[PDB]
Amino acid sequence: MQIKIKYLDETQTRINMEQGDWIDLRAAEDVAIKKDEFKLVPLGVAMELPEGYEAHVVPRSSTYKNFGVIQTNSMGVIDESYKGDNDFWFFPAYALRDTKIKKGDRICQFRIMKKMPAVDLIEVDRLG
Amino acid sequence: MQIKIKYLDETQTRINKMEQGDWIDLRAAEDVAIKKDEFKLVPLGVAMELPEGYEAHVVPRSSTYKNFGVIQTNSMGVIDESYKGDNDFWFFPAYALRDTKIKKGDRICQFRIMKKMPAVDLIEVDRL
Amino acid sequence: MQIKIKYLDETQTRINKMQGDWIDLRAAEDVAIKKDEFKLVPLGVAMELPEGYEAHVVPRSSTYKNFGVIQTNSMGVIDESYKGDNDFWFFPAYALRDTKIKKGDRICQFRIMKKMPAVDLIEVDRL
Ligand SMILES: O=c1ccn([C@H]2C[C@H](O)[C@@H](COP(=O)(O)NP(=O)(O)OP(=O)(O)O)O2)c(=O)[nH]1
Ligand SMILES: O=c1ccn([C@H]2C[C@H](O)[C@@H](COP(=O)(O)NP(=O)(O)OP(=O)(O)O)O2)c(=O)[nH]1
Ligand SMILES: O=c1ccn([C@H]2C[C@H](O)[C@@H](COP(=O)(O)NP(=O)(O)OP(=O)(O)O)O2)c(=O)[nH]1
Ligand SMILES: [Mg+2]
């Protein structure tokens, strides 16, 4: 199973695994964020995911410790269909304190996972 | 694979975007106003009987923070197959980072289903 | 399918068997957190998961109203790799109000999941 991945540019740090571990993604540019402010931290990457698969994106264990940001959407769902040449991943960050992220910083991690199977949604007037 | 769904009332907007594999959006069952640093359970006006052996996972949409200034306090909501009774309506536990207003009908979060953990024996052991 | 689990001390309340359900985990000691402050809440447990699996840890839906805390990493990911006698799970809590969590309190919950299959990251210039 392969993932095709476009980098924003040559300065981005490429990421190498087939170990099953979640893969760290990194900030594409310096972002500074005041306490109680919001910013998209661009991750400088676009990917074509395997057919029938999602990416899930959550912070790293140490993200809060080292940057004082929480992830606004809790968990990011990157769908297989987000595979365009301008479809760059971002990390939506709310700073609970003054913070600076530097280009290259590892700020979140992801894995892939089979989309849910197909499903008939059937309205009913009463449940058991 | 089918899910039964019951709606609080005819007012509610059927979520008739059954899966092409994608997560599915849920909507505020009523007008809800939440002030800065206030918490509210936002009712989603749906009860469901998930497939045997499954659970549902709920998370915010990508734009939920931009548009309503709320985060989901439980990060990823877990809904077990057993939450299927006739009064088991889904909610969105929302904490507000600014003064905000959700209107009835609004898409505020999204779900998919996924198979439960297989059974597991838990052994206590002195060391590892 | 088997998980080997090691409690911190005798004091800790062992957990029941279960069925596929997320298992609740308990705070290992009383912890007080002021508004707008962060603290790791020990869950007094370390575990050897199955070869090829990870654990996901998230709050109960009631953690906020009962205890006033969110989990700053959203969902903790614990790898098969974290299986040593000192590898004790924690709940990273940030308090949005003053709060005292009390030993024994069930504050978050977990399950296991097969890890991602092996994949190739093939760099490309266009998509
Ligand atoms: O944390 C995230 C979350 C989403 N994303 C990406 C994936 C998503 O496809 C895109 C946002 O554009 P839309 O809001 O239109 N996508 P959406 O999730 O709304 O898809 P849909 O409308 O199909 O439900 O941002 C991230 O990069 N990081
Ligand atoms: O975001 C959510 C999360 C859960 N739920 C529902 C489904 C689930 O069966 C029920 C309880 O979930 P939790 O286990 O996370 N909270 P708690 O453990 O307090 O409830 P219970 O004691 O029933 O397990 O609430 C929601 O409607 N929205
Ligand atoms: O909420 C959490 C999250 C992680 N953990 C555990 C598992 C993890 O291995 C450990 C943190 O160690 P590291 O800082 O080395 N992070 P991790 O092992 O995930 O990094 P890598 O991606 O290199 O494995 O804490 C918790 O107890 N609670
Ligand atoms: Mg529970």
At residue B19's C-alpha, the angle toward residues B13 and B20, to 5°, is 130
Classify residue C20 by burial, with Cβ atoms within 10 Å: 0-12, 13-18, 19+: middle
Residue B4 lies in a domain: yes
d(CA B67, CA B56): 24
| Partners of C79 in beta bridges | C54
Q: Which amino acid is at B34?
A: I
| Residue B109 belongs to a domain | yes
CATH number at residue A97: 2.70.40.10
Q: Evaluate whether residue A128 is within a structural domain.
A: no
Cα(B30) to centroid of ligand 1, in Å?
25
CA distance B38 to B96: 6
Range of the domain at B86: 1-116
Chain C residue numbers touching B125 (CB-CB < 8 A):
4-6
Q: Is residue C45 part of a domain?
A: yes
Q: Is residue C125 part of a domain?
A: no
B49 beta partners:
B4
**Of A19, A15, A46, residue with least CA distance to C121:** A15
Count of domains observed in chain A: 1
**Greatest extent of chain C over all pairs of C-alpha atoms, in Å:** 58
- Rounded Cα distance between B26 and B110, Å, is 6
Q: Give me the long-range contacts of A65-68 (CB less than 8 A, separation at least 24).
A: A67/A93, A67/A95, A67/A99, A67/A101, A67/A105, A67/A107, A68/A95, A68/A96, A68/A97, A68/A98, A68/A99
Say which of A4, A20, A50 has its CB closest to residue C124. Answer: A4
Q: Are C84 and C46 in contact (CB under 8 A)?
A: yes
What technique determined this structure?
A: X-ray
- The answer as to whether B123 is a domain residue is no
Domain membership of residue B39 (yes or no) is yes
Q: How many CA atoms lie within 13 A of C55 on its CB side?
A: 28
Phi, psi (deg, nearest 5) at residue B21: 100, -20
Pairwise CA distance, residues A32 & A105, whole Å: 13
Question: Is B125 inside a domain boundary?
Answer: no
Is the CB of A1 inside 8 Å of chain B's CB atoms? no
